[PDB]
Design a protein around this ligand. Sequence first.
Ligand SMILES: [Mg+2]
Ligand SMILES: [Mg+2]
Ligand SMILES: [Mg+2]
Ligand SMILES: [Mg+2]
Ligand SMILES: [Mg+2]
Ligand SMILES: [Mg+2]
Ligand SMILES: [Mg+2]
Ligand SMILES: [Mg+2]
Ligand SMILES: [Mg+2]
Ligand SMILES: [Mg+2]
Lengths: 205, 170, 48, 159, 293
Amino acid sequence: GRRPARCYRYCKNKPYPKSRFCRGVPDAKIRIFDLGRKKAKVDEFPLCGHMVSDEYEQLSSEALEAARICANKYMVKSCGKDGFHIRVRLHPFHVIRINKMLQTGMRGAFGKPQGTVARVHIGQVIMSIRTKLQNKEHVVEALRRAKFKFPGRQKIHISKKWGFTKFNADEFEDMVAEKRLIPDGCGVKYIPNRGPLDKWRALHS
Amino acid sequence: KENPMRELRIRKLCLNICVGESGDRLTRAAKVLEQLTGQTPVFSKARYTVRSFGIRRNEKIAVHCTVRGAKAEEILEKGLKVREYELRKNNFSDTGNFGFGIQEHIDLGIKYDPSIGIYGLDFYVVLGRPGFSIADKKRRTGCIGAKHRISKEEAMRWFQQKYDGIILPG
Amino acid sequence: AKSKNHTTHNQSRKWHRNGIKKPRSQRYESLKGVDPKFLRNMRFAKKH
Amino acid sequence: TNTKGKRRGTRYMFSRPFRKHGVVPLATYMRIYKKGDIVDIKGMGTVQKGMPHKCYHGKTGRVYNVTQHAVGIVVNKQVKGKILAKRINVRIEHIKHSKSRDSFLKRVKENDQKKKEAKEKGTWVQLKRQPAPPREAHFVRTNGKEPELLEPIPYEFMA
Amino acid sequence: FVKVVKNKAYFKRYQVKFRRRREGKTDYYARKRLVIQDKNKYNTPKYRMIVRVTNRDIICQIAYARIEGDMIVCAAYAHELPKYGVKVGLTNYAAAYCTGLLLARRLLNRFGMDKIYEGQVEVTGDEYNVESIDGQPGAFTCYLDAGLARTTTGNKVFGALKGAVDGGLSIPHSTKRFPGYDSESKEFNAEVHRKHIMGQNVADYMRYLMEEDEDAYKKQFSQYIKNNVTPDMMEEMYKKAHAAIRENPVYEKKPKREVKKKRWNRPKMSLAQKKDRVAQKKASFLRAQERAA
RNA sequence: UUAUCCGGUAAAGCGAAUGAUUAGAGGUCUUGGGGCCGAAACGAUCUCAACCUAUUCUCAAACUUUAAAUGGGUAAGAAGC
RNA sequence: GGACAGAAACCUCCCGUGGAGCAGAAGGGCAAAAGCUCGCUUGAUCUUGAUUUUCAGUACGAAUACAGACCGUGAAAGCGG
RNA sequence: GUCUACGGCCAUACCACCCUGAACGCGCCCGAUCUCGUCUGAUCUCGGAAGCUAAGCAGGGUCGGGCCUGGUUAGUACUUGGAUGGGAGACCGCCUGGGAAUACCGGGUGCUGUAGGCUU
Ligand SMILES: [Mg+2]
Ligand SMILES: [Mg+2]
Ligand SMILES: [Mg+2]
Ligand SMILES: [Mg+2]
Ligand SMILES: [Mg+2]
Ligand SMILES: [Mg+2]
Ligand SMILES: [Mg+2]
Ligand SMILES: [Mg+2]
Ligand SMILES: [Mg+2]
Ligand SMILES: [Mg+2]
């Protein structure tokens, strides 16, 4: 008995998250945001693609999970069970209010919480997929399929960064060869020169 | 050679008896260590109420006293002579202090009284170095310093070299 | 029989029609509200 | 409707700034305030005695009375229709001197000095603050190198 | 393990105290009520008779608050007592009285009122207040500043206060913390105060030590022996010191000897030196690692 | 317009306080849970859990280190020097 | 760290920017204090005016600077109707 | 160059550790008779001068954390006013003006007032 997304499709109200003043909020439909073999080093999964919205809209938690399931299904079908990493970069926090009649009318009109919705800005990344270099078409198709699960307009862009990092892919291996970046799992650690030299001598040891 | 101002000296030896209740037993236990130390001790009042021990707030449940000077040295000496000058390294704290406990006060040298009964004590020693008074002086309070502290290894070396004790591992 | 509660729409135009004039400053402002002891000292000085 | 509390809506206005809590500086207590001096109002939450009302925070007034701990000042409060030059009593730590009058005082002293000077010399000098005139004609010397050619960069979606 | 309390965010939110408060020298809560003159006074100076007791001397000054700091008008120390007769024992109650008397008389000399406001020429030890006289200029009045001293009965701070009051300063006070005010019956007898002013308690201790244990007497009082100061003439010596102080309370500055411009501390390292040090350390570490590999 | 005072919205931030919130890493005996050699042993061994350390993804009208545009007072003289 | 002592009874050392407490709901504020413990006391008193707060710039309630006596406390500066 | 007493501005001054302190000063330090206060002269108060820079305190150092101040972020985000501009909308672009904050990369690590000393 959930209302159509066209009702809560606009960012009509100021953010109203689950807090001390808002109680009884049902748990968000989506609770898993990372899939695949998330225990993957940054070296083995260079390629990264992003599903990024193109409008200032609202995405429901159920819509996020439906897109996540569809993308996961295609990835396990094409690239393999243990050959990708899907990360949803949007967490629904804005709870939505529902006013239900049963003849009180508009008196005391303030809806109780109904669900959780994630607010998206212009150009903000919705979903991210990290995999090997040769698996580019599969990721593009996977995100293209998952676009149909979302309202509004979304586009697929292949970022120039190395995986789920803020460093450029082309310079990533050069920097790690120069020992400025330390792999620590799915991410990397940036080593500046502003620390005590004991860290520097340990790294160069 | 070494600077004499780094000598390790005992600053305070605190003796307490936690009988866990107030009344005649509390006074009786207080008289024991009062007779031992030669000075009037002070009662400690409980902070919170727990039904497992049957103790409530503001209830005098323990008697404690602090001894300095040569009398503290004598009390510590007779306390250790019943422990056979042996201690475990766990007894030494990280701040250079240590302590132990005796099951009965009779073995220290006091004479048993049937009306008094037996009671145990906790002997806790806080070591010190000349200059520790700046940590609590009213006028210009200052930090003690990194090199002026007493390490756990330093405290146990002092114990095993001054009283010729032994620290068995465990 | 509901009706709107509070409004401040045309008030600014009503004010500026006659102008929001500042109070007319005048030389030798009165001495009310000053410290009575200081006031007594001043009156004695003017008396003598 | 809203409540009519004295300190309603003053959560951040009366709050002390970041890393300036605790003991108030004694310079404010040590400064002297003559009557007729232009002063500013800025409430401080550390001392609640003689707290100026929120409607006067940030205003600028003139001192007309001085007591042992507080000074009486007259400030222009805007009411619905008119402006009221109403007088309030505020403790000294909520008040501080204003340099707005000081700037005029320095300028008037300077022009009086430069009017007494050069008066017997026969020359005439400018005393009124003329507004910033349009920039006069000047020569720009392209010393050698050609001016850089600027063109818009092609678009790329960084996100 | 354990959460690090003094983490990177701890110093971000850390707010420091005032420099004096961190050093523990001053008490700003008392300073606010001590130095702040009423605004209606319109820049009338308020004078504080600051008394400080150190391990080896006693500082007695008077000062008034200003936006750029306090101004020291008259300063009297205890190390200058040997100029007046007190060669040794500069940190006792008698010395506190002497330096307080010296501060008061020196201030009066600076303001040119030596002959006026004679005060207590001879010691009595009872309560006394300088009452201003008509026609002549009014008496100087200041307020005691004990700082952080725990002001109980019989404090050397109050001894300096008594000395200044006898010197001719109208400092408000009461004979409650003076040595001799017993608390069981709540009354004051001047005889005990007179004994402490003249240091008779020290003389009694000196007699007690030399009568019961001479070796401990040498251990306690040795500079007194070196200065051949016997208990019998203790009060007479202090009376002579009082007369000399009240006779010539002025202070003369020692001549300023010209230095040779020699620095006693290592100068601050410069940016180039510290940037070269790390380059040397890194070069040394790598060149040692390769030859040790 | 020229000077001089006030704000806490827009924006931005969680490697900064408070409240949320995701997932990788490295530690240890600080403890628990699934085991194992053991009379036992922090003697030893895989973990899985909580914990700590640097990180990483996303939020706040009743959060905020910062922090606008717009705007709100005062002054721009002979009631002065 | 220390007998019984255990997860928690009491004693000692170190760290400890307010993560506590200030009667209540919340906000602001507070570290030799506004908080914890003592000691002494009734300025929670008598009196006339001025001003702020919703404001009509009227009241009540509440509040702020002063003034005149009686006082309390503190060594004092001061603080307290 | 520097210290002490009283401070002003309240981290460029704090915090962790290490090194050096001529002299003076500040302390550490020695005792409880008196002043005074404690369970304990531990703190406090008092009387002192045998020893000691060991510590505090002073100065310096850390490719230190922090803090202050710059560049980058960026004419980005945001925004006064305007349009019979686009778009179904969400919103976006433009004209006229103003103009931020992270991360990241640099520089620095107390200035000074009164009085009195040491460096004869
Ligand atoms: Mg709405
Ligand atoms: Mg005080
Ligand atoms: Mg607001
Ligand atoms: Mg916002
Ligand atoms: Mg107090
Ligand atoms: Mg009165
Ligand atoms: Mg001692
Ligand atoms: Mg030293
Ligand atoms: Mg740094
Ligand atoms: Mg100086």
